[model samples]
Target: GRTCPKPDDLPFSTVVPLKTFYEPGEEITYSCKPGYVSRGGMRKFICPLTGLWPINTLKCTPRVCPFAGILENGAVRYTTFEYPNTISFSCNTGFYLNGADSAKCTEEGKWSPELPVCAPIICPPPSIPTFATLRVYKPSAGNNSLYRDTAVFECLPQHAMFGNDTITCTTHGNWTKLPECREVKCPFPSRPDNGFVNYPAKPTLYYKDKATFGCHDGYSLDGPEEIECTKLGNWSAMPSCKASCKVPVKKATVVYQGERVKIQEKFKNGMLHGDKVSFFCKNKEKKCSYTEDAQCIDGTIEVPKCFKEHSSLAFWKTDASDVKPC
Candidate 1:
């Protein structure tokens, strides 16, 4: 009896165990392997006395898995959904891929791992500190803070801010660094000339705090008594000290308080700033008297050179006011 050789280049295996050769008139059956589908095939092939087997007509193709419909807020990148093929998922901005990033088509005509979902990335609304307000251009998403959304903060009346004015909701569903807001600070108040400054007990004076000004013995306060710290991180208007004036005449009679008196008796203490005193002046041509006033401005006062004073030593001289009226 003649024998036939085994077949070559077959995607399927023999339904029964294989042998080196098949005896004359022997037949072989075939079945598709795993991960393959039989499109069309002959179940059996016959071996004849020529020592060769008839051609195997078994047609097998890769199994095809059902395609996933639409990927929400995401994309599915896949050439084909057949066996051994992998499909990947990609999410749009502001979303996170919630499942397996990629899936493989299995031999059993099913996709491995369910389709991935693109989920929204969210953050809680940022906290607002006291004395702070949302800027005119607030975060656009209202209460729901999504990825990349920004919140702008502005420190209001008497408050100063540190760090960046804006914060962002990040991809990890958390917020960026928050800015710090505190009371506005003013540089230490400067001491006014010829005066001292009295400030709060604390080393640093903050908004709404006051600084008082006082002058030395010979000076007077000229402006507001105190200055205040303002919201702009600056101290309000400051005060200065003005000096008093000393009467220049050693021996002379002057009009003091609308009455005739000696300058020595009335001006024992130097006149304060803005004080006024009148002196009697004689008209040489008319031989009559008139009065001229001298004002203590800050620290200076000038006596009229034309006024003549009676000598305290000599017995008698005609005083300007005693003679006659002009």
Candidate 2:
């Protein structure tokens, strides 16, 4: 009898043992690798009288496991569901995993351990601090609080808030720190130079009190006229009065107090800040006088460009008509 033929290299499969030759009627078996299964063919081959092996059409393919299933508030990661593969699990923020973090694909074409679950994280209900009252706008359904819930707080009468007035449940399953309320008393308002403040004639000021300021007659206010005590027991910014501007020109006539007079006579000292005075200019085409205003601001005034002083008594008399109001 002739010796049996050796098996050819097969994908995902291997022969049982090493053998160089086989007698007539001898047999050999082929098996699939760890993660594969046989695809339906005779696993055994035998020697024949013709000195050749019989043709075999057996194959090995990857084994598949069941669906991993969805995880609530969690996620699963794996490349494939084939045998010998692994799956990893993780929970979302404010959630915890209740079972194993990973599972393995078994040889029996099924997952070794069951898929894990995600459980909600809980926190205790928020409490109120001294002089503060908690207001639950969105309360939890049960006795405990869950993630992303919110609460508001308010201070009692004569008290003021010192920290955040609103708090919320965070993703870490913890409530924000509570705020505190303390006695409120506004500090004395600061007085600005060159200004006078009109406020209540009391020794101390409380929240919501108001104070008004005024500048002297020759000066002007540069900031807010009034300020109020804030809820945090602090007064708003105080304003200052700025010095009045003086007329700059020396030889011009100015219309002051509804009278046309020389600048030296009308403003012997100087024009007060924010004062308005008019200057006369000759209108060549109309043969009459036109008036333009000069405003004093912070000691600076603009000089009229068209003004020209009379040279003599005769020129003054002739140009009188030109200085006359239109």
Candidate 3:
């Protein structure tokens, strides 16, 4: 009756509405508007029973165009903001376009981000021989980079390299063609030691070619050690020449008081000749002696003199001695 009602008997209240905003392409989730719980709470809430809905509808915003990665090249120019509202791709000169050249922004506010590759516009990897070495340097950022900024080719030592050392990116974004690398060699029949030759009137000598050498008048050739340059760019062993003289042997005599004397001596031009040599007597007959009236020739006789004579006389004279005779 209109009489006093108990608190537990009072009717439940209604739920409030939820409000939210989102940007284009933005996503939003739903939840109960407000409280109209049963015995449990929000989890047990159901619409019409407490006049509250358990879950609200999800909302999705509109879409817009997306930006793309920037690309550039020297030979080709693009209109500022080229392909606005769309993503575009292209290759540099000399390079052919590869993969997904261009893409458009979708109503989902997304544009394709696939990578585009530019292939060599002209020649492929160089065909340098094993004799040569190669080098390359990458470009820096911010500036429009180029292909084949620079290249260098070098030959092994003892060999000469032939070709250009530098290359640059052309307006077409291509590398300049490289010259061939070949070996350079020196000539053969190199001059011999102590001997030489005048180059032929034409000095144009090819690799492995030879020159001739002659030993000088008193010299003899000892080596083919002579040389020529090889196709491999190396020289042969060097030739050498030498000089010598004939030895002399002869007999000589040194004279002194005794025979068969030994003396210091020297020889010149095959002659036993020196000032220290002296002559002496070797035979007894040739020995020196002192005598009177004797010859002194032939290294003999120390002195010379005449011989003396003596006689005895008898008693009686030839006539006046008569008495003695009676």
Candidate 4:
């Protein structure tokens, strides 16, 4: 009788050319050189049974660098992995490239380097509005990346910004937003009363107009009826009260004892007292008292005068004495 050996006792094992080998947590990749076609898959496969190797490793590639991205502003820039093999980008007419000029496929099935962006050729700074200011956070070297960073736009006095204050770069390496600058307008001037507020073209008070005033009946204007607004926004004059009475004094005259006496209308508490007032007598022998004669001083009453005395002659025994009078 002959002894048979088990298949487990045999140490011989078959190997596949496309199979991959790797350790635990190790990666295996497959790739084709630029312009080369791989008969197997374009990605690397790892051995799952032992977690140590790649299985069916293959690469599918195309010949020459094919266009992968759109030309923005006549410029093109792209990141790797968007295409199966090597992808190339070019700028249109009047445009330039910024990053690596050309990239090739690596043995690891990845692009050699990232493609740079293509941008329009610029000769001068970007256009900006008048009476406005521009602020750049990061200056760009080329027109392709000019909008790759944020920029702020500000308007000067008497002006305003209409759109967003800031613009930012996007993942596509382009400016996604646009800002607008606008002008500000001033309002009209206004004038109010003393207790009221005045509005000028601006918040700061300043006179740009004139004002007029009128006084009520029985009241006179101490100041000008028309006032001009000052540079400080103040009135030039103030109003005042008017006198109530007219023609304060009247003409009149008085006579006493055949002599002229002065008359006056002015008085305090309706009474008069002053100098230049005198008393007179009708006859040389006549006499007058101070209270009665000097009372004419105030002009409020008539002046007093002294009168001549009458004499009673001795005509008593006229009848008897008349017989012998002859």
Candidate 5:
């Protein structure tokens, strides 16, 4: 009797247990195995006279599932999409995965775990110090600020901030360093020369506070009468007092109140700075009189060079002021 050997190993599986040998005219059937696809229907073979199975035309390939490589705001890492293969998913910065990080390919050619979601991280509302202000701020985020959001801060009036004005929400759902509000003050103002300063009784003056300056009698202010505390923790400016001038001559006829008068009776001690006086002089060749004006300057007075004081004993000598006009 003629005999044939059993079918050789392949991607397919036999429908029944295989025998070591079979008589001629016996037939064997095969189908695609699990995790594989069938190109042709079940394959069948007939035992041949030489006892060797003929070549099989059946084809089996690994199963492939639908697309699983795409992930929004994230990425998927995998070697292949074929059956029984595994893939992993991850989210980009500022986002976190909301589902399983890994998924499996089933024998049915379907992913086992649901696709993951990339959720944006959120941070609680920023903390504002009691002395700090948002400085024209509007609510951009309802109750929670999204990751990487920015905020600005500043100290209230008359105060200073100690850190950066802006801060950003981090990927970890927390805010960066928060600024601090603090007091800013300037040392008490110094009194000016020949003047006095008056400011608040407190030990120091805060921003925008002012100091009043006053000069004693016969002295005037030279700069701004009021100085203010500034953001740089210093006073605005310091003013000085201008000294008053004194009339030089004791007994002489000079113009006072726009008229002729003796300084001996008009200015007993001295005259205030910026006061003016004119002395009468005789144009000897012309037989006429002219007036030369003199002004009192800071702490000093200059007499006219051409002026000559007439003695009271010479009654007949005509006074220069009484002569004909030049």
Candidate 6:
């Protein structure tokens, strides 16, 4: 029985319009699929009189496009060298896309269109508002500003700034919004409790004006003694006056102004916080006096524990050396 032999499968190629059987000497052709190329071989195979197919040397391989080439300040991405594959492009920071973002491999084994390019992003120089000055930390080459370039803004005296104080050139080729400067005035400062401000009585305070504070006789000033009006039209800081401690001893003499005096005459009212006072005690062995100072802090003061008063006549008769200052 005479019958055609089945043809072997071709590499990277398929038989065009496959047939169930072929008469002896009848032929079949093979073609490469899209995105593939046929290598030199027998495109047609025939069944001989011996009912066997002739050897098929036909071959096919993936079609390859030319190198997409490197992009300046940018990069490309692709997985395979075959046709129909796509390559994506991206720009680096401070650069912007100038052409196609992606290219596709065509059936002809060539990339579509052309490779994209990256161009340095440009931004216009920032403008300065009235009463404000601009400082460029990174100046752009020539007259154009590049991405990531920065500028700072500061308000002049008597002016307050609103919005961001710094701006930067963005990858989108634009500068951030500039700040605005406006005349600013602060209201009269509120008086601190138990404290007085040295600022003159005024309806309004301009920026940079200063106010000094002083605590009353029996109070101490806490925090900064002076505050200044800031560019934001607000006081720098508010101070408080803390209550002072009163001397606790009733009959003991206190050292005041380098001399020992009765507590009543020296500190009739009380002592302000942070004030130092001393007490004297006679050293029994040397029969000489030594003075120790105690400080008042936040209503706390230490009473000297070493003081020992002698009999009235003995206290008066003691030598002046017994009352030396510490």
RMSD of 5: 15.7
Range of the 10 consecutive residues with the lowest summed lDDT in candidate 4: 4-13
Taking the tens digit of each residue's C-alpha lDDT, what string does model 2 give over 1-326? 46765667688788765377777777777888877897684388766777587776878887888887568888989898888789989999878888899998877787778778999877677778889887655557477777777889988866778789888887666778888888777777767677788888889877667899987766676667888887767777667776775546556676776777887677777776667787778887767887778877766777667766565554435443245567
TM-score ranking of the models:
6, 2, 1, 5, 3, 4
User: Which scores higher on TM-score, 2 or 6?
Assistant: 6
Q: Which ten residues in a row have the lowest lDDT in candidate 6?
A: 317-326
lDDT for every model?
A: 0.79, 0.75, 0.39, 0.41, 0.80, 0.76
TM-score result, candidate 3: 0.25
Give the C-alpha miss distance for residue 57 in model 5, angstroms: 3.7
Off by over 4 Å in 1: 12-16, 25-27, 68-70, 136-143, 191-326
Choose the strongest candidate by lDDT.
Answer: 5
Candidate 5, 199-257: lDDT as tens digits: 98886579878899998877777678889887678778877776766657646777877
- List, residue by residue over 122-219, the lDDT tens digit for candidate 4: 33234455656886544565543433356677766445456677766554445545665544333332322221222334454223343455444433
Cα error, candidate 6, residue 1 (Å) = 6.0
Model 6 C-alpha lDDT per residue in residues 27-91, reported as the tens digit of each score = 78888877788667438767677777667666777788888757888888878757868898998
For model 6, the superposed segments whose C-alpha errors exceed 4 Å read 188-204, 214-220, 231-234, 237-246, 250-271, 274-326
Model 3 ranges with Cα > 4 A deviation: 1-51, 55-110, 113-121, 124-209, 212-239, 242-326
lDDT of 5 at 42: 76
Question: Residue-pair clashes per candidate, as listed?
Answer: 0, 3, 12, 11, 1, 1
Clashing pairs in 2: 244-273, 245-273, 245-299
Cα TM-score per model: 0.54, 0.61, 0.25, 0.25, 0.49, 0.68
Lowest summed lDDT across 10 adjacent residues in model 1 is found at 8-17
Cα lDDT over the full model 3: 0.39
lDDT per residue for candidate 3 within 1-326, as digits (tens), equals 11211111113322222123222322222332222223323222222323233343222222334334555431223332222345557766546665677665443445555445555543234445466666653453234444545556665554454557555555455466655556565653455556675434445554545555566654555555245656556555555555422212122233323333332233232111111223222222533322222221222222111111111143332211111211
lDDT of 3 at 219: 52
Show model 2 residue runs off by greater than 4 Å. 39-42, 46-51, 72-80, 87-102, 119-122, 129-131, 144-146, 156-163, 176-184, 190-203, 206-210, 214-220, 229-234, 241-326
